[PDB]
């Protein structure tokens, strides 16, 4: 079959408009790969503008965008590598490894966006997860397959808590884990990868147990908005085909919803639902609903919620407060006293904390 291709007509910042031919118009949430001199750039459709034109968001730096360049469709969403080979390698939202260690020869390749599990597949989790931390093992035990929330502000130690969780779980459990770095700092990213290398969870010359889905904030807002669902796709691929319990780690759900509202700001997306994003409910439920304890396996989603100066009035922290079942708030005041884990014994509740 002839590759499906078109011409770029407009590029407004991170938003690129491409014109396609007759019967050549693709669907939304697809991949529009444009051969760029600075590597490879692919665009994802957000809405149809009519006149055989599609409004897209750049998944990679918009440097060098010229109207009329040949952009070829991939036949769907940009498939990311999924499989055991992805473990120990940082994978971005575009599937092109940023570790210069060779392409990930994954078993399969799944699109970022997929139908969430049906209502029957939904179930509750009532199994204890061994995290290796006394306070959170006793007072607020984790749920195997549930949605955990790691609240905390700035300088409280959320990301280090997440990486310690991955290390302890990998040491105490052979199930694979995935860490999506939505809104992840590059210096923090280098720290995370160095810690993963030094802790033995990531073995370059052997078998690893955690795959990074780092977001790399300096990429356009679409990458930050979709790294979360990329890591979620990795998690569900690990859960379904392998049939093992996996550990989904959201770097910052607040950054995910901020990036969603951001990409809404680039496009029309007239904010109506909460005020800053009208779609927020739709994609937020699409993401959260996809982490489900299906009959194949269980995915435990440990998301970190960043509250700026306790901005509970904003609907964004409350939306995350609605999803989770057990909280692990990391109030800074406790860390200022000397207990650097900073988890509040009285504010970190657990749903499954019962006799």
């Amino acid at each position: 079959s002839t590759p499906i291709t078109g011409k770029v007509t407009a590029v407004i910042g991170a938003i690129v408009d491409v014109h396609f031919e007759q019967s050549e118009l693709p669907a939304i949430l697809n991949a529009l790969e444009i051969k760029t001199p600075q590597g490879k750039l692919v665009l994802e459709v957000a809405q149809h503008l009519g006149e055989n034109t599609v409004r897209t968001i750049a998944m990679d730096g918009t440097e060098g965008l010229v109207r009329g360049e040949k952009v070829l469709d991939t036949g769907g969403p940009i498939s990311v590598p999924v499989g055991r080979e992805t473990l120990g390698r940082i994978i971005n939202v575009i599937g092109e490894p940023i570790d210069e260690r060779g392409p990930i020869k994954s078993k399969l390749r799944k699109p970022i966006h997929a139908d969430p599990p049906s209502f029957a597949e939904q179930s509750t989790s009532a199994e204890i997860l061994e995290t290796g931390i006394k306070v959170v093992d006793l007072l607020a035990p984790y749920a195997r397959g549930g949605k955990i929330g790691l609240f905390g502000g700035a300088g409280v130690g959320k990301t280090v808590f997440i990486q310690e969780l991955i290390n302890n779980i990998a040491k105490a459990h052979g199930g694979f884990s995935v860490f999506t770095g939505v809104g992840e700092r590059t210096r923090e990213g280098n720290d995370l990868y160095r810690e993963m290398k030094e802790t033995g969870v990531i073995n370059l010359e052997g078998e690893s147990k955690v795959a990074l889905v780092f977001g790399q904030m300096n990429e356009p807002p679409g990458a930050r908005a979709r790294v979360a669902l990329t890591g979620l796709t990795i998690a569900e691929y690990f859960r379904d085909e392998e049939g093992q319990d996996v550990l989904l780690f959201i770097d910052n759900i607040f950054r995910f919803t901020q990036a969603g509202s951001e990409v809404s700001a680039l496009l029309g997306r007239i904010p109506s639902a909460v005020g800053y994003q009208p779609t927020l409910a739709t994609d937020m439920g699409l993401l959260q609903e996809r982490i489900t304890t299906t009959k194949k396996g269980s995915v435990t989603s440990v998301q970190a919620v960043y509250v700026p100066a306790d901005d509970l009035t904003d609907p964004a922290p409350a939306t995350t407060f609605a999803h989770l079942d057990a909280t692990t708030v990391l109030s800074r005041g406790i860390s200022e006293l000397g207990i650097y884990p900073a988890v509040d014994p009285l504010d970190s509740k657990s749903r499954l904390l019962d006799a």
Partner: protein, 338 residues
């Protein structure tokens, strides 16, 4: 003279049959799909808020009927619908199945089962949006129904057919009192007398599958799931599904109300119903009103909450009871929608 005839003959082709064999009255071509919206030119015989098929699997409704394009709200994900797709009108206004088959089953804004236990055998199909009962065929709400919770039973008793509002903040236990009433109906729903029976229906507009699943599970643990009808338009579902689901449940309750039976509708989290309809209107070129809500959200809420009513003994004395909640923030019910 021969050349005009030849060009008239050859004009039939090279035009993708947009005018020939289609007439653009029951069919059309989508100009562009947006955020749950597909603008399509044609459908000269389209009806107001009438269902339409996109020839892809997803449904749609022509809530807006602009002369240049028929604004259709997508009934599902907007991924599978593409610009230029050939659409076909269903020929009927948006309607959902109604009957006793939905008892002990799950449904959605379109009335289809989500858990997939089996096909729905509802005895009849009623329109999603029907006119409220008239001023004459109604009676004063007099049959009492016990709530279970003392704080509402002994202080603000809800009557059979009264549209009482249990309004609260983000975290106030509105669903808790709703489930309290649902489980208190078990005392009479396991009996024989239909007058004391109350087939309750609960809406899950915009509520994620996790919370709805936990609610259905804890409802099943009390063995009260049999006499309760559960409709769900989840957060993952598009905003049009969230907008329709309360109307679906309105039709479900009206089926029991017009059949002489007593039904209870609990319009859980109608605030996100209001915001979903606001999103649909703002995305449909409708003029914004107060708090960016369209001026017809009050129209929608009036139409929805007037369905639940106590009919006279002429109509079998069936009553539909409404218990919506409004998830206000900060206790400020002074806003426009509350």
């Amino acid at each position: 003279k021969a050349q005009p005839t030849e060009v008239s003959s050859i004009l039939e082709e090279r035009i993708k049959g947009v005018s020939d064999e289609a007439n653009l009255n029951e069919t059309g071509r989508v100009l562009a799909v947006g955020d749950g919206i597909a603008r399509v030119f044609g459908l000269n015989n389209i009806q107001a808020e009438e269902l339409v098929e996109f020839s892809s699997g997803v449904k749609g409704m022509a809530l807006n009927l602009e002369p240049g394009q028929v604004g259709i709200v997508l009934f599902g994900s907007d991924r599978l619908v593409k610009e230029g797709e050939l659409v076909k009108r269903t020929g009927n206004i948006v309607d959902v199945p109604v009957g006793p088959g939905l008892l002990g089953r799950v449904v959605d804004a379109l009335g289809n089962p989500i858990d997939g236990k089996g096909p729905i055998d509802a005895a009849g199909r009623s329109r999603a949006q029907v006119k409220a009962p008239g001023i004459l065929p109604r009676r004063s709400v007099h049959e009492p129904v016990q709530t279970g919770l003392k704080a509402v039973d002994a202080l603000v008793p809800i009557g059979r057919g009264q549209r009482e509002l249990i309004i609260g903040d983000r975290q106030t236990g509105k669903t808790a009192v709703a489930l309290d009433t649902i489980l208190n109906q078990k005392r009479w729903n396991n009996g024989s007398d239909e007058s004391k029976k109350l087939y309750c229906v609960y809406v899950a507009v915009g509520q994620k599958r996790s919370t709805v699943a936990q609610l259905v599970q804890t409802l099943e643990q009390h063995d009260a799931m049999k006499y309760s009808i559960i409709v769900a338009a989840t957060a993952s579902e598009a905003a049009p599904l969230q907008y329709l689901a309360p109307f679906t449940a309105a039709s479900i309750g009206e089926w029991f109300r017009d059949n002489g039976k007593h039904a209870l509708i609990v319009y859980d989290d109608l605030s996100k119903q209001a915001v979903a309809y606001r999103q649909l209107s703002l995305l449909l070129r409708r003029p914004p009103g107060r708090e960016a809500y369209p001026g017809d959200v009050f129209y929608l809420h009036s139409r929805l909450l007037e369905r639940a009513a106590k009919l006279s003994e002429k109509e079998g004395s069936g009553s539909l009871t409404a218990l919506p909640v409004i998830e206000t923030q900060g206790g400020d019910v002074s806003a426009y929608i509350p």
